Amino acid sequence: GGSPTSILDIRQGPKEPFRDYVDRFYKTLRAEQASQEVKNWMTETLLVQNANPDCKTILKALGPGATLEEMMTACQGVGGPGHKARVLAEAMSQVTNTATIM
Amino acid sequence: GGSPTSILDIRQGPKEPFRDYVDRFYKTLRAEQASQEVKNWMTETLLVQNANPDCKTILKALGPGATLEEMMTACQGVGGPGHKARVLAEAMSQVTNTATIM
Amino acid sequence: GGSPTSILDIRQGPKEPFRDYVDRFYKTLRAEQASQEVKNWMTETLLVQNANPDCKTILKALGPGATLEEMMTACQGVGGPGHKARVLAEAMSQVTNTATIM
Amino acid sequence: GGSPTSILDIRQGPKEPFRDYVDRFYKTLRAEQASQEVKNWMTETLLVQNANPDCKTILKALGPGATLEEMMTACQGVGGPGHKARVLAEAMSQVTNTATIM
Amino acid sequence: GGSPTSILDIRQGPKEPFRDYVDRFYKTLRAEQASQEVKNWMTETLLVQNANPDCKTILKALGPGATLEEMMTACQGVGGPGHKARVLAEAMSQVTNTATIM
Amino acid sequence: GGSPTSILDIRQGPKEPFRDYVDRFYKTLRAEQASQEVKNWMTETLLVQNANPDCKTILKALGPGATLEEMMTACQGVGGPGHKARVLAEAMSQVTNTATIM
Numbered sequence A, B, C, D, E, F: 001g002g003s004p005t006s007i008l009d010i011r012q013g014p015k016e017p018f019r020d021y022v023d024r025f026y027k028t029l030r031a032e033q034a035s036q037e038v039k040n041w042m043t044e045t046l047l048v049q050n051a052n053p054d055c056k057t058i059l060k061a062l063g064p065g066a067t068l069e070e071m072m073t074a075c076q077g078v079g080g081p082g083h084k085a086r087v088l089a090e091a092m093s094q095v096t097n098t099a100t101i102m
């Protein structure tokens, strides 16, 4: 997108949820002086790309075409139980098994 | 319901308990021009969906038709580490032996 | 007392200490319009039932009628080093051992 | 003690360190209307008893008669890396060995 | 580097995201009275050495020459589920294997 | 120490990084009433002894005579993801290995 402040850097921390950040990506767009085509594009390309790898891995898992409502339901668990319950055990139970890796 | 800010996005944080969020859902509802029925429908359909996979996993667990008194009570340990006394110990002990999942 | 803001909903949080809730419950009772016996009925009836599973499980353990000095201390362990150093960490081996559960 | 607020209940949270609370206990003493000796008695009896089982277990370990400088330095470890590193690990391997407990 | 309060110690906290700190590194460069060449130099020379081993280890992961955009995406992995779940799931299970180490 | 607030004992919280505690140790030295030599004498001794057992052990571990700059980078690695990744990884199996301890 490249529009100042609004999308070149609007990013989601790790504790910052996918839900709170989308506003950081929207409310901030309101600040950029862009055309609606300039913004809507910014919501498709830069949203998924510059936002929280816990969830980007979910945005490419759900994959494109997911409405934000889809990236919303799944990336809601970003957090200690929803995601982290599944994130700690995936690496923990994988490498333990590292003699054989699927 | 699709009413501004409340049912379009009122949400429950992964650290935010079933109570703080319930206050929000109830609060921004006072911000949308809504009748008594406008809000009663808004509670059942969105609260369960747009709210923290922890409580959301409990609300379905409660079985629809359970008064909020129950969504409150069951989702009380919902919590920062609270509910999770059951969430981490399971994910950490079901996947742990080899591959057996029950 | 079924008093507004004070009992019907006063509730201790998960990340929350027995203190601040006890303070919430206490501090607000003056705020309700009740009779003296009523309030006393709340300190004994609600304070245990509507507060923080790390600690509620304790209150039910030390038991009703136990001096607050006793409730306090045990529930002051709630919170990382006191209650936490013990329980899930033990829950790891309770379900690992799940073939046999005592 | 019984002097209003200061020593009847001044308590140390679980995550709250020995210094943050000791400060509460001290400062709150300045506010009570106690004789010089009243307060002196209070610093001893209530500082060790109503303060965070992590540090309280330490104050008992150091042994009564230790100056606060000693209670302080020792209790500073209360916290995740210094005190928690030790108890989680010990509680974990002490009971794992459960057939034999020393 | 040694320029006024910018590079003397601008350091990323262990829990401070790369993103949050880097600003303290940027705006401070803006905040000092340096020449344009000094600051450009201060970016590469100083941002990596003084930036939180979680990310200072990532800046090693990208491999020098990566545009900061790469440092941004990569260090965005700094965080609990992405970078902490890897050091928690890796370091714990590696040394466990200490009979044999690769 | 004995100078006001600064060196009598200035202390670091567990989560308090070397940037939240030491910074205090710095800003506060400008306030303590010390001779130019005093402060130089106090910046060495008190800084290492009264600060965060993780980092305190680091400052002693690098070995005296190291520049503080050498203690700063070296103590910026205090922290859960960074520092706890290393000690959490070891303490758990250090004792598991208790049949043989090296």
Ligand SMILES: O=P(O)(O)O[C@H]1[C@H](OP(=O)(O)O)[C@@H](OP(=O)(O)O)[C@H](OP(=O)(O)O)[C@@H](OP(=O)(O)O)[C@H]1OP(=O)(O)O
Pocket (backbone or CB within 6 Å): A080, B015, B079, B080, B081, B082, C014, C015, C016, C078, C079, C080, C081, C084, D014, D015, D079, D080
């Ligand atoms: O900082 P501590 O006193 O050592 O304890 C913390 C704290 O728990 P408390 O609610 O009891 O204060 C965190 O709470 P937050 O303020 O981060 O919400 C909790 O977080 P979670 O509920 O999200 O798990 C965290 O756990 P973690 O470091 O896994 O985020 C847990 O630390 P311990 O599990 O290490 O005791």
Ligand SMILES: CC(C)(C)c1ccc([C@H](Cn2cccc(C(F)(F)F)c2=O)NC2Cc3ccccc3C2)cc1
Pocket (backbone or CB within 6 Å): A080, A081, A084, B079, B080, B081, B082, B083, B084, B085, B088, C014, C015, C054, C078, C079, C080, C083, C084, C085, C086, C087, C088, C089, D088
């Ligand atoms: C090993 C130790 C650090 C001590 C430990 C173990 C596991 C717990 C908790 C389980 N548990 C235990 C006591 C009190 C509560 C409270 F206060 F939070 F309700 C609670 O949930 N379950 C976490 C919830 C959570 C969140 C994110 C990552 C891991 C876990 C496990 C906390 C601490």
